[PDB]
Amino acid sequence: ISASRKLQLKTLLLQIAKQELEREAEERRGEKGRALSTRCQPLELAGLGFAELQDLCRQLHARVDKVDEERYDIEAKVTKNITEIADLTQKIFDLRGKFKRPTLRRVRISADAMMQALLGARAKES
Amino acid sequence: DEDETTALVCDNGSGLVKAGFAGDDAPRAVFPSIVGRPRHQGVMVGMGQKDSYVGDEAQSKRGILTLKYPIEHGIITNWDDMEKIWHHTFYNELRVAPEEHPTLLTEAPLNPKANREKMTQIMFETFNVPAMYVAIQAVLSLYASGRTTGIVLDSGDGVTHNVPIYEGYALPHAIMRLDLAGRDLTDYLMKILTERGYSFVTTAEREIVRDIKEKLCYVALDFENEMATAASSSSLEKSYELPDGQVITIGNERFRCPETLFQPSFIGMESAGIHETTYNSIMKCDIDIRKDLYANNVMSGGTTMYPGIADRMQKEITALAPSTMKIKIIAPPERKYSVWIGGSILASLSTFQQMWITKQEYDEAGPSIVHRKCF
Amino acid sequence: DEDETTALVCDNGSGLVKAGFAGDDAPRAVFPSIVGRPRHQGVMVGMGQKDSYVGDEAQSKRGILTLKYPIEHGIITNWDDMEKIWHHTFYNELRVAPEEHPTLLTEAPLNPKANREKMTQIMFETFNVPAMYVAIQAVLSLYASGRTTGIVLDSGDGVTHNVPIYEGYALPHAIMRLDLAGRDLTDYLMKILTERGYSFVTTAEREIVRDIKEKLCYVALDFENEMATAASSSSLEKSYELPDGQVITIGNERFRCPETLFQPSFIGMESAGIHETTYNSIMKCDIDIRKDLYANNVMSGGTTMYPGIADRMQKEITALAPSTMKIKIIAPPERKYSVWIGGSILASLSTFQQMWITKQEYDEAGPSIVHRKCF
Amino acid sequence: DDIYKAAVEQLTEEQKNEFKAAFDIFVLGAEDGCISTKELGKVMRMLGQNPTPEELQEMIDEVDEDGSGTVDFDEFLVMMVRCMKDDSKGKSEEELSDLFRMFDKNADGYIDLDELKIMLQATGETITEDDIEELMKDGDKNNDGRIDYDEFLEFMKGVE
Amino acid sequence: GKRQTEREKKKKILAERRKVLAIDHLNEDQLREKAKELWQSIYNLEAEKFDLQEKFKQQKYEINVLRNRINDNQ
Ligand SMILES: Nc1ncnc2c1ncn2[C@@H]1O[C@H](COP(=O)(O)OP(=O)(O)O)[C@@H](O)[C@H]1O
Ligand SMILES: Nc1ncnc2c1ncn2[C@@H]1O[C@H](COP(=O)(O)OP(=O)(O)O)[C@@H](O)[C@H]1O
Ligand SMILES: [Ca+2]
Ligand SMILES: [Ca+2]
Ligand SMILES: [Ca+2]
Ligand SMILES: [Mg+2]
Ligand SMILES: [Mg+2]
Hints:
The structure is cut from a larger assembly and holds one copy of chain A (126 residues), two copies of chain B (375 residues), one copy of chain D (160 residues) and one copy of chain E (74 residues). With 375 residues, chain B is α+β, with helices and mostly antiparallel strands. Chain B has four domains: 5-31 and 73-138 and 338-371, ATPase, nucleotide binding domain (Nucleotidyltransferase, domain 5, 2-Layer Sandwich); 32-72, Actin, Chain A, domain 2 (Roll), CATH 2.30.36.70; 139-185 and 275-337, Nucleotidyltransferase, domain 5 (2-Layer Sandwich), CATH 3.30.420.40; 186-274, Actin, Chain A, domain 4, CATH 3.90.640.10. Chain B has 16 helices and 17 strands. Chain D is elongated and about 60 Å long. Chain D has helices at residues 2-10, 13-26, 37-47, 53-61, 73-79, 93-103, 113-123, 129-139, 149-154; strands spanning 111-112, 146-147. A two-stranded antiparallel ribbon of chain D has the order 1-2. With 160 residues, chain D is mostly helical. Chain D contains nine helices and two strands, in the order H-H-H-H-H-H-E-H-H-E-H. Chain D is 56% helix and 2% strand. With 74 residues, chain E is mainly alpha-helical. The interface between B and C is medium-sized, with 16 and 20 residues. One calcium ion (CA) binds at residues 104, 106, 108, 110-112, 115 of chain D. Chain E: Belongs to the troponin T family. Chain E: This is Troponin T, cardiac muscle. Chain E: GO terms for molecular function: actin binding; identical protein binding; tropomyosin binding; troponin C binding; troponin I binding. Chain E: One of its GO terms (cellular component) is striated muscle thin filament.
């Protein structure tokens, strides 16, 4: 085999990877929509009286506070998780550093200028 | 990692934290009680932004991090270090959350109420724990010893507790704590080594000489006679090789370092030596059980790992007490972990599973009421 | 010529200016730090009226132009030469204006405040630069080395800096600069060659003998023994061919020229040799990290291109320090450009793109406040 | 070598003929019939730039596929096409984590050979067993049967 | 003592978002539309929560992944 075939396989991997990510994003959007429809159901204001609307609004405010409490707990969890992820990632960076600093070679002179200087008028396709 | 819903035994002893699951015979996560804080401010880019090291991560780097002791004499100085060491033990070694199993912690005898209320509040409000329990170390050590009678001498790092228990019975009135332990011995060795000629004034060297003491320092069988025979030293003085390579030569100082325990006058305190304080405690007990306390005395604490403590105790007590009865001193092997071991065997009983304190009753009652319920 | 908006890394090291774009592995524009000024006044018509030569244009003509060093020991003597060398590098080699990309300059450790404020002012007021940044050479050299621990020895042309960095931590209190380097070695070789018989007293010859030293002069593995065996020379003395053609014969002087670094008494200064000063610096550090500094010592500077420095350092440190541990000295290939290389890899990070200093904040704050912000 | 050989095969026939002519020009009068450190440095001087010897060695080591320490025609194409940096512009860390996750579909922390093979099967291109083995080796460093995240990161050099 | 205040601030954070509501100056029809805006707030809230949840899951995988790295380069 050759190396060009491996590069072609890798780039095909990348595009099929991106399409998969888009599909997963669409599935997550659909799951979010369905979960929203299940949890937060519409209201039924038809037939409610003056005091009944007041009681409904008070109940909605209580539900508002309950959901914010849940969200705040989940957000505290997410912040702890962010902190832990940062710590672990930096520890892994310190571990894996050692001798793996790379660079692209600079004596690799640009072909366009090199092609002009070597050929003159013969260089047309390159 | 754990398939049994059992309490995590975390002995937060002064100087060494020993954490492990219940049922085990030894703590898996053993690390010193120290907190390393970045001293300077670096312009470097890429290193961990973590602003608070702990445990082995701090032990590995003691030249850059200023070292602070999270516990002093027994009273908790800084609570941030407390939250750091528990959060670390939970989410870096054990790899388990406290929201799935209980936690049997061990605290020292005669501690402040602020300490207890603070740790309980951090373990209930902040962390979601189904149930907590505070336990005295002496009872668990006597459990691990496999007896019900004797006086437990627990010598930690900054405090020393003498606790008499006869017929499995506690005596809260006789428990007397004295802040003489490994730190004051490290300070005495440091000042006498400064008098020898090698002067240092930083904490990293203090921990190094503490380790040197743990490895080499022993107790003398006859102080003055060893002084006389060491005046002309030959095999009495030893040449230790520092982990860095500097050749240190230490002679008599070794067996004169723990001697400060027997002669607190060296540190200019009117307090009596550990042996004399224990003897006075025995007089404070009743005469009927005094012989049993003589025959069942038990020891605990890492400081007891020095060779020659049992014989010194026997000669001193024989010189103080009559020499007509029998005064046998028993020291169980691996006594230091024995306390923790007790915790393990204490967390497997179903009755103990019925003596835990759940969140809801604590929340309504409040921390102070919880203090009344325990004792 | 450049299609990426990235900072221009211009290392203005004493003796050699190395300029190039970020991302490259070596400086493209490398020229000595010299300024040639027309000595006489010519009645000729047609020649360039340019009153200030620089770089290769001055190197090509050293007989007509009186040569002045734009940097001495570290302190900037003349600022006109500074403006000349930057304006030249900008509008004669790189063919790019500073109004389109940043500029990451590298300055020596422990430099005057006047130097920093002056260069920053010339880079902000006169030239329109979107952002500037001053960086110490030792950190970038340690970056290029690919480590975070060790003591960097940077020997430029007129100054030598010893900078210890352990675990990435800079130590601004231990950095000690000493003005012993290539110029004092050139002066020593010149006076000893004048002692040999070939006497010269002009700067062009001084640069020529400097090049001869760079090409031939090496470090001795045993000074006195080489002196004895060179007393009766055979292969120890070499006959060099001057670029002009005069046949020079140089024997032991070679490996006695850099020896002045190890024995500053030759130049009548109480300062200690580079090795002894580094050793004293190691004692000034803490003991805990001293072994790591022994195992990770790094070198930088063009002066380190001589063959035989690593072995000499190893024998001298082994003779000074104990011979029980392991003291490996590491010298990365092409160490001289490594510093510049670091600059390149330091200018590609987005975070570093966030740590630049824009014009407006500097203008309101003023230069002194800028000094506080950096350190 | 991957991006290099890809660019080589992307060349046209007329370009490759010019490359062969330039090779004959460089080895004009040589003694090994290839471009060694000596001949490469001679060409660099003929151009203008000066190359470091260790740099010449490292460059010849980055273009050879045989092991001769010299540059032949098959390596002349690589040495004359490496100018464009194909493996630059690394994907964001979040994108890299996404790549590792979707390659680790069963949620385990390891890209077993089954996942890599089904991925190659899904791509649609005719996957050769040699390609599978070479990619498996390129990823799985310690050769334990799976590509962890560090080995996966190693799999991104020469890829874009 | 600051930690107790930290827990108090946690409860105080929740207290800050809630504000007094007035149902006396509103009529029959307006209250209905106002109820709807309260409802949308609810909706909004859960959405962010959901997001967090999904991120949490993702983040947990990250953790797992990270752990493996330290178990492969030790
Ligand atoms: N292996 C050992 N050898 C000697 N001394 C020790 C050892 N381990 C701990 N110590 C000493 O014990 C003290 C800490 O004891 P601690 O861990 O609190 O005991 P416990 O956990 O039984 O309460 C320190 O001062 C330390 O010097
Ligand atoms: N190729 C070389 N061989 C020997 N010595 C050199 C060489 N290049 C530079 N030097 C010496 O180094 C000094 C200049 O070093 P400098 O360019 O400041 O190093 P850096 O750029 O790493 O700070 C001069 O005294 C010069 O004699
Ligand atoms: Ca070849
Ligand atoms: Ca998998
Ligand atoms: Ca593998
Ligand atoms: Mg103890
Ligand atoms: Mg230098």
